[PDB]
From TrEMBL, chain C:
<comment type="subunit">
    <text>Homomultimer; hexamer. Interacts with OPG148.</text>
</comment>
<comment type="similarity">
    <text>Belongs to the orthopoxvirus OPG117 family.</text>
</comment>
<comment type="function">
    <text>Multifunctional protein required for genome uncoating and replication. Major viral uncoating protein that is required for the release of the viral genome from incoming viral cores containing the viral DNA genome. Possesses an ATPase activity that is required for hexamerization and uncoating.</text>
</comment>
<protein>
    <recommendedName>
        <fullName>Uncoating factor OPG117</fullName>
    </recommendedName>
</protein>
Length: 463, 463, 87
C-alpha cells in the first residue's frame, strides 16, 4: 500500500522534520537541528535515518529518486508550523543543551525537545565543570585581580558579574553596557575569556554598528547578529578630536527593539531575532548627537581600575590616578586564555552568577549617573515640571514669580525662565546645553515674543 | 545491492570530496583541492577515479546518467563540514606541501591531508634545495651587502630577518612593517627575491591601500587578494609635501581585524581571510592624519643604509647622506633574479630563518620608538603624571613647591603648563596633540578658574 | 575599433562602461574629434585613465556581464586638432 508513503509516515512519526514559520525545514541529523535555505537536507535525513526502519524499508532508500518521492510525501504532510529558539534559559552546545536554571546536561532526545538552531561550537566536558580545581583557583585569582572585592567596588563588581552572566540568556535585553577604562586594564582579557566560554554565540564587530545607519540597502551589520547572544565592539573612534561620527540615538534605540530590520546579501529576509547582550569597549567619555529621556534608560557603565604594567614602567603606573591597583603583567596569559585552559571554569563561574541572578524575571537596569553627558539632563527632570493638570488654582501666587496665565495654561516668558535657570547652573559651563534646550523647547505666542510651558519645582515649594 | 551506492561508498572512502562551510564541495583531481561553485567537479572526479575501482564498477561509470546518480548519492552522504587552509606552518607548492617546522616535503596523498587550495604556482625541485651551491654563496654575499652583520645593525638585521621569514606563514601577525630607506638602497632586490621565492602568494599593491577608504563600494585592492601570504607596496608618494592623502589610521586598523567590510566588483561574497605580512616601502618618514594609542601598537620599522650608484653620478650620490655607504651597482642582477637563479637558495634561507624563530608561537613585536611622529605620545606618557590616591599624605611638602590642595587634588594653572610643555615638545610640531591633551585631562570648578590635575616629574624628583 | 572621447574625458571605472570592455583583444583604438580645451566648458584629460590604459590589465565591465578582467592589446591613437591639456 504505497511503501514510500509508509516510509514517509514513519519518518514523520520520529518527529525529525519540522516546518518553521519562515518557510524552512529543520532536520535532526547527528544530534543537532540543521537547516539550509536554498538546499533542503530532507534527503540527507532520509538516508541517515534509513537505519531505524524495518529491513524491507531500508533498501528502498538507496535510490535518489525514491528518496525524492519520500521527501515530496513528507513535504505534503507538513501543514502546521513550529517556533524555534523559544527557550531563553537554555545554553546549546555541540553535543547537548545545558539547563541554566538547574545545571544538568542533556543529550540526544533529551536535548531534542528544545529547538535550538545555534550552538557554542564546542563539546561540553562534564569532567571540567567542577567547583574545585587549580584552573578554577587561577581563574578566581585573575578575576579578583581585575575587579577587587573591596567595599568601594562592590556595586561595580556586582554590575560586572550581572552583565557578564546575562550573555547566557537567549532573550532580548533592555540595556547597552559600556566598558570604560584605560588601555591594558582587563577589558580585552574579559573579552577573550567570554569568547572562550561561549564559543560561536559570541561575535565581534567594529564601531560601524553605532555611528552608521542600519537601513542602507543590503546590510550585513545587523543580519549577522541573528540569534547571537553577545555582541562586542572594540576600539571606539574617540570623539575628543573633531571629525568622528557621533553615536546615533536612533541606532541605540533600535538595538534594543525586539524585532529589527536588515538583510544580508542575496537575501529577502529582513527579520532577525535580537538576543544579543551588546557590550561596547571604549577608553573615553562617549558623546551622543541628541540626548532625550528615553535614551537615558538604555545605558549602563562598568569601570575598570586595575592596570598591568612591566616592572620598568611600574613607577609610572603607580603615579597615575586613573589606576587604583597595580599588578604584574603576564605575557603567556593570552597564551593559556586562547588555549581554552579556563573555558569551563569561566563557564561554571558564569552559571553560578546566573543562578545568583536567576530570579523568575531577569532584566537589565540602566545607570545614567555615570555618564557626564547625562549630567545636564538628569537634573532637568528634577527641577522643571511641564504645564500640566496640577497647577491652575495657583496662578495667584505664581504670577508674582513671572508666570503668566494664557488660555488657562501657566506659561513662562523667555527672559524670566532664562534668569531663573542661570542662577542654578553656570552660564559658561552649561551654556551649550542651556542654549540647546532653549532652541529645542520654545513656543511662539506671536512672531516676536516666545514663552515656555515649564514651571520650576522650587517655586512650587516656595509659598 | 544497489551497485551505484557501493560505488559512492568506495569513492567516499577514498576521502576525495569534502563539504565546506560555504556550501561548496572541494574535489581532489590531479594533486590539488579545487572547487567550482557554478559547476561542481564531482562527475569529473568520478570519471577520473573510475580506474581505482574494480572492473565491474569501471564498466558502469561510463554513462553520464550513472555518474549523476553516484554524485547524488555522494552529496547525500556528506553531512559534516570540513576546515580548509587551517595550517599556518605549511607552504603549499604545485606538487606538494612543504613543512616549515620539520623541513620535509610531501607529494600527492601525503599533501592530501593539509587541505590547501592555493599554491605558489611552481613545482618543487629538491635537488636545488641544498645548502651547498655557488648560488647560495652569491645570495649570502648579496644579503651581507644589503644588510651587514655589524654590531650596530644587530637589532635592525634581526628585525629584517624576522619580517622576511614571516612571509612563509599564515598565523596571527598584526603589525605593518615599514621598510625605511631612500631610493636605490636595495629594497627592490629584496622585493624581487621574495617574489621569486614565494611565487603566486605574493602581491604588489599601490598607494591606494593606505590613504583611500577600503570599504567604499566595490574595491579589489582590499578584496581581490584572498589567502595571500605577502603584500608589498612601493613607489609611495611623499607625504612630507602637502598635497597627498595621508596614511589614515583607520585603514591601518582595518588591515588587521577579524572582520572585513569591503567587496570587489560584482562580488556579494565579501568574506575573505588572511593577515598578510604587509611591508611598506617608502623613501620618506610616514605621516598620519590621526595618531592615538592604538596606532603605535601596529607599526614596525626596518632601515636600509647601503647604496649602489653608477660611476657617472657617483659624486652626487656620495654627496648625499641618503645612504650610509656607497657601492657599485650591478646591471645583470635584475636579469639573473628574473631567471629565478636564487629562488631555491632564498627559499632555504627563509626556511632556516623560520626554524631559528620557530618557537611554538611566532608573533611580531611593534617598535614605534623609531618613528619621530609618535615621539610626543611616548615621552609625555613617561614624563607627565597626574595625582594619585597615594599622593594625599604628601601635599604638605608639595604646597611650598607652588601647588594648592583642593578636594585632595593637586592643580596647576594653564599658562604655566603651556610654558613648561613648550620645552619638551614644541607646539610647532605637536600643537594639536598638546591642545587635545589639555582639553582631555583638565577639570573645572568654575569656567574662569582653569585647573589641570597633573604634577611635573621634575618637581617630583627634586626634593 | 573607433571610439569617442569618453575614454579620455570621463572616468573609466564609473558604472557600465562598454568603451573600456568592448576593446577586449583589439589591436588598435582610434578616437577622433577631441573636444579641445581652447573652449572653456570641456573636461580635461585625466592622468588616471592614461596610466590605466597602459597597465596590462584594465578594470571595466560590459553591459549585463560579470567579467572585469580583459586583455589589453590595443595601440591607442588619439586624433586632435588643438593642443591637449592635462590636469
Amino acid at each position: 500500500g504505497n511503501k514510500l508513503f509508509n516510509i514517509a509516515q514513519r519518518i514523520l512519526d520520529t518527529n525529525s522534520v519540522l516546518l518553521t514559520e519562515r518557510g524552512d525545514h529543520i532536520v535532526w541529523i547527528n544530534n543537532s537541528w540543521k537547516f539550509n535555505s536554498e538546499e533542503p537536507l530532507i534527503t540527507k535525513l532520509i538516508l541517515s535515518i534509513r537505519h531505524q526502519l524495518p529491513k524491507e524499508y531500508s533498501s528502498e532508500l538507496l535510490c535518489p529518486r525514491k528518496r525524492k518521492t519520500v521527501e515530496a510525501n513528507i513535504r505534503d504532510m507538513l501543514v502546521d508550523s513550529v517556533e524555534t529558539d523559544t527557550y531563553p534559559d537554555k545554553l546549546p552546545f555541540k553535543n547537548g543543551v545545558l539547563d541554566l536554571v538547574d545545571g544538568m546536561f542533556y543529550s540526544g532526545d533529551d536535548a531534542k525537545k528544545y529547538t535550538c538552531t545555534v550552538s557554542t561550537g564546542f563539546k561540553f566536558d562534564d569532567t571540567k565543570f567542577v567547583e574545585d580545581s587549580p584552573e578554577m583557583e587561577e581563574l578566581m585569582n585573575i578575576i579578583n585581580d581585575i575587579q577587587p572585592l573591596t567595599d568601594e567596588n562592590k556595586k561595580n563588581r556586582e554590575l560586572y558579574e550581572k552583565t557578564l552572566s546575562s550573555c547566557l540568556c537567549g532573550a532580548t535585553k533592555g540595556c547597552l553596557t559600556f566598558f570604560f577604562g584605560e588601555t591594558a586594564t582587563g577589558k580585552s582579557t574579559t573579552k577573550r575569556l567570554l569568547k572562550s566560554a561561549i564559543g560561536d554565540l559570541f561575535v565581534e564587530t567594529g564601531q560601524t554598528i553605532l555611528t552608521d545607519v542600519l537601513d542602507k540597502g543590503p546590510n550585513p551589520f545587523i543580519a549577522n547578529m541573528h540569534l547571537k547572544r553577545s555582541v562586542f565592539c572594540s576600539e571606539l573612534p574617540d570623539f575628543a578630536c573633531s571629525g568622528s561620527k557621533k553615536i546615533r540615538s536612533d541606532n541605540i534605540k533600535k538595538l534594543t527593539e525586539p524585532c529589527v530590520i536588515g538583510r544580508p546579501c542575496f537575501s529577502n529576509k529582513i527579520n532577525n531575532r535580537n538576543h544579543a547582550t551588546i557590550i561596547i569597549d571604549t577608553n573615553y567619555k562617549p558623546v551622543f548627537d541628541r540626548i532625550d529621556n528615553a535614551l537615558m534608560r538604555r545605558i549602563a557603565v562598568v569601570r575598570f581600575r586595575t592596570h598591568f604594567s612591566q616592572p620598568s614602567g611600574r613607577e609610572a603606573a603607580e603615579n597615575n590616578d586613573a589606576y587604583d591597583k597595580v599588578k604584574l603583567l603576564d605575557e603567556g596569559l593570552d597564551g593559556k586564555i586562547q588555549n581554552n585552559r579556563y573555558r569551563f571554569a569561566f563557564l561554571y563561574l558564569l552559571v553560578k552568577w546566573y543562578k545568583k541572578y536567576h530570579i523568575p524575571i531577569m532584566k537589565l537596569y540602566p545607570t545614567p549617573e555615570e555618564i557626564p553627558d547625562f549630567a545636564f539632563y538628569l537634573k532637568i527632570g528634577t527641577l522643571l515640571v511641564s504645564s500640566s493638570v496640577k497647577h491652575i488654582p495657583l496662578m495667584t501666587d505664581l504670577s508674582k514669580k513671572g508666570y503668566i496665565l494664557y488660555d488657562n495654561v501657566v506659561t513662562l516668558p523667555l527672559t524670566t525662565f532664562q534668569q531663573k535657570i542661570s542662577k542654578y547652573f553656570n552660564s559658561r559651563l552649561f551654556g551649550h546645553d542651556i542654549e540647546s534646550f532653549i532652541n529645542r523647547h520654545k513656543k511662539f505666542a506671536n512672531v516676536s515674543d516666545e514663552y515656555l510651558q515649564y514651571i520650576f519645582i522650587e517655586d512650587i515649594s516656595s509659598p
